[PDB]
Structure 1
């Protein structure tokens, strides 16, 4: 029985219920994430930017079965082309816009990775990816506006692969945290 989250806090409580069991109802999770109306005051604590690249800010450690974080993207900041380590990944915009470009898993052949599609994710929208869908790149293409997104990963994971668009070659990356629970984590 899914209800609208009134606040980020409420959203988090609801996520603990949704992940109370062993399996994930993706459509239900995506629905509740979307239903949350971004309130900049509720997440300002987590919205820590860096001048040079996007930051990953842990919000909730979950119940062992998921994590929740906020990512902050300066003008022109973007990600690698990357996977998500056999986890569910949900992305909701809290501020600004992000361009998401989808790529297919590369063949063993060295080949230019060609964009399967792109979309503009706008404030409050919740997107979903998993490895069965493909790979993606996420970018703030704005010249004038920062972006902020809310991400849920289940199970949690701290490693992923980056892919070279020219070749499809992958490299294993360890993902870091800029902050945890509002506290900067050098």
Structure 2
């Protein structure tokens, strides 16, 4: 039974219930993520920015079945075009806006990757992606407002691929945590 998360801590408790089993009800998880009303005091601990690129800040390690982290995007910071390593990926805005651009999986032939669509993800909205849907880039295109997003991945993964927009060629990238549980992890 899906109730509105009252706080971030309540959301985490609810997520532990929703991932108690071996499968994932994507629509339920997205709904509860969306229903949490971002409260900046509850996540300030995790919102550790870097001047030069976006940061990944682990919030909860889940139950063997998911990670939950907060990404902090300075003005103009963005990601690669990337996949999600056969995992579910949910992205909820906690502050600001992000542009999500969708791409199809490239063919083996070297070719420009042409965007299939784009949208602006706004505060409190929750998006979802997986490899069956396609690839995406996420960017804070604002010149004046940092963005903060809440990401849930299931199963957890710490590698993925970045895709060269010019060719479709991919390279494996190892993903690192800027902090874990509020502690900077150099």
- Confirm or deny a common fold (TM above 0.5): yes
Deviation per residue, 1:66-101 (Å, 9 max, x gap): 010000000000000000000000000000000000
Instruction: Supply the RMSD in Å over aligned alpha carbons.
Output: 0.2
Which segments of 5 or more consecutive residues in structure 1 lack a partner in the other structure?
Answer: none
Shift of 1:15: 0.2
CA offsets, 1:115-134, max 9 Å, x none? 00000000000000000000
Partner of 1:2: 2
- Equivalent residues, number: 186
3-state DSSP of counterpart to 1:115: coil
Deviation at 1:140, TM superposition (A): 0.2
Q: CA deviation at 1:174?
A: 0.2
Note if 1:163 corresponds to 2:163: yes
Deviations 1:31-50 (A, max 9, x none): 00000000000000000000
Give 1:40's aligned residue. Answer: 40
Extract structure 1 runs of 4+ deviating beyond 2 A: none
Question: Residue 9 of structure 1: CA displacement?
Answer: 0.1
CA–CA distance in structure 2, aligned partners of residues 123 and 178 of structure 1: 23
Matches of 1:146 and 1:17, distance apart in 2: 32
SS in 2 for 1:145: coil
- Distance in structure 2 (CA, Å) of the matches to 1:22 and 1:99: 32
SS in 2 for 1:2: coil
CA distance in 1, matches of 2:20, 2:170: 34
